[model samples]
Target: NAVTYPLPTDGSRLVGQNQVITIPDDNKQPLEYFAAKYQMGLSNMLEANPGVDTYLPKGGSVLNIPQQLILPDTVHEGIIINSAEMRLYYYPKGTNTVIVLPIGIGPINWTTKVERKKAGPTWTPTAKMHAEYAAAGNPLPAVVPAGPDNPMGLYALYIGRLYAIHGTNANFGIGLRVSHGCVRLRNDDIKFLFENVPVGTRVQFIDEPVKATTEPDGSRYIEVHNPLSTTEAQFQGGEIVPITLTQPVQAVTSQSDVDQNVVEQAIQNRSGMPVRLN
Candidate 1:
């Protein structure tokens, strides 16, 4: 059930609840396959269940579906990308629901931004990109037409100078840092966004690895993700990136009601799910 979550009209930071799904006997597939099947990203799944076999888990093993999330601390409109989480959030105008999708973001060498928007976009490799591919003994054509075989998939929303939010032909890399400087989404997600999100809508790109919020009921919760690496080498080597806590997060954690031990564990785990700190 890939559906938009109902947002509270009275201004609530929380959205959905965590769900659990079992692996079917006939669907003995890899983690990426289940991630896509459940509308989740590979990295999120892997982080949520560390040490789980990537190829095939037990046919009946239970998996946690991290549908719950803390909204990014920003305007709740248009598109929002938390690069650290490798997830994109879309808020349709006048619809009090938010559509969440896993995405592949730009590598450390290149980062995407917020700017222009486009639809039915054609893709052309940059001179540097072409040279890089050529040097690797795989040269790209001058331009890639829109089709199934096209890497840019069906639709694209151009953002910034060279970066664009588009879909990919492949099934993997949705939750990894694999893109050059653009954002990559699944075919269905991009299609939904393409048909719904209007042109000239405001798009914001943020690098928040840690998001914390205090609910109206006075309960505190925090969600943490692995911080983006500063370099390609660090990213490829799976280096442990340090987390920078914002002032607001520090204040939240310092509250007496918040459990420091739970917060520490959440930070250490980097599970990318909202955990109650109180």
Candidate 2:
């Protein structure tokens, strides 16, 4: 279920197309099963399909695959992780295709970066992490070996001193703020990225909850996602989420061609889909 899109050669800012998938059978599989199966993040899927059960979505339910996106307003190079969207974009060297994948990011207390890379990495919980686990009545091993049970999965891209973009052994938490200051991806997706993306690839981490762009034909688009919480209380509550717009984003919304009503709805919906603002 890996999604790769051709980079717009005509100077267009858009990539990928929106899609839909139908659940199969009446099995009460957790929503994360389908999220991981389709290479989507859990939160992103939930945002796209509001009111859906988190654990067991109804059988035969229609799910929106928000594959459509407006490229981040940055240099189309290396890796770009939009924490606000819980997705990762990789622009391979000398290719017109950009690979998109869902990811799990650090919680409110942590941030990610692009620094180093590694393969077949091991895991060692930080002292603070160990203390926190102990406080929660769970003790962690001094070191987690590289194996099936290891949280780091098979590969890791070290982005900072203690943080990395790595694989997870679990199927859930792909698109949520559940990491301990690192980036988490599906095992398969991490393997793909680990094998393809080289060391020292320029990685940039941005918190862009709102992305707006103008296509070559003068069509305007605004892709909105719920902003990442700045506090643990806000993250837990999941209510009273605040939306902040940069000056540039405000400029786009203020444009005469943009539909104000649609903009308002997009902000309210915060479904992480790129809406046409005509």
Candidate 3:
């Protein structure tokens, strides 16, 4: 579901509401099923529901669907992909709504515009992709034909010289950093973007894990996601990662009425859900 939320005219950064669901006793589905059903990424689900199994979450388990978000501090126009949250935000040209979809990224990422768009896009494996696959004794074809076997899936929105926003053939990679440097959306999500987004649409990328906002009524909120680890060891260490607050987040937490201890806990928890500090 490419969930579309109407933008607020007032200066409030919060959008969408958190939802909770209970898995059935005989549930035979994995997190991906619920994730796709709720338009959530695996990472977001994992962040919101700690200790949940990736494969078969125990029946009768309660899950927090983290649809609520703190919109990244950015220009509220065009398409904004916040790598930290593993989601994309799209503001239609004539509509006052934003379509947010979970995305999968690669080690190398970008912030570029939609230079062109296409459906059933082919794949030309790059030198890095070739070497990366070859090292695993699995060589890829120089040019992969456009089809179900193609990694670009059924649709693509070319944004930069070598980067793109496209869907994947696999159903499990949408919320993980497993792509070849382009943004990966769900097949249906990419198709929606392909059909609706304009060729000249602007796209920007950000990596903000901590977002804080003081709403119009003087209430304060903060949303924190696990900061993307900077080093390979840190990424695999499974330890609590350090969070470096951006200027705006720092300013918000420093302004007042927000307790440093509580902010620190939220940053440490990385719940990926909005928390009202006030």
- CA lDDT of every candidate: 0.78, 0.80, 0.84
Better of 1 and 3 by TM-score: 3
Count clashing residue pairs per candidate.
Answer: 0, 0, 0
Q: Give me the candidate number with maximum TM-score.
A: 3
Better of 2 and 3 by TM-score: 3
- Candidate 3 regions exceeding 4 Å error are 107-111, 131-139, 179-181, 230-238
By lDDT, the better pick of 1 and 2 is: 2
Q: Give Cα distance to truth, residue 160, candidate 3, Å.
A: 1.4
Model 2 lDDT vs. the true structure?
Answer: 0.80
TM-score of each: 0.88, 0.89, 0.92
Tens-place lDDT digits, model 1, residues 175-248: 88784637898888888878888777677778888999888888889998778663433433366666778987
Please list the residue runs of candidate 1 whose C-alpha ends up more than 4 Å from where it truly belongs after superposition: 1-3, 25-27, 107-120, 134-139, 230-239
List the pairs of residues colliding in candidate 1.
none
Highest lDDT: give the candidate number. Answer: 3
Tens-place lDDT per residue, model 3, 140-228, is: 88888999988889999998777888888886887787736478998778898998999999898878878999999987889988776
Q: Which ten residues in a row have the lowest lDDT in candidate 2?
A: 107-116
RMSD of each predicted structure: 3.3, 3.1, 2.5
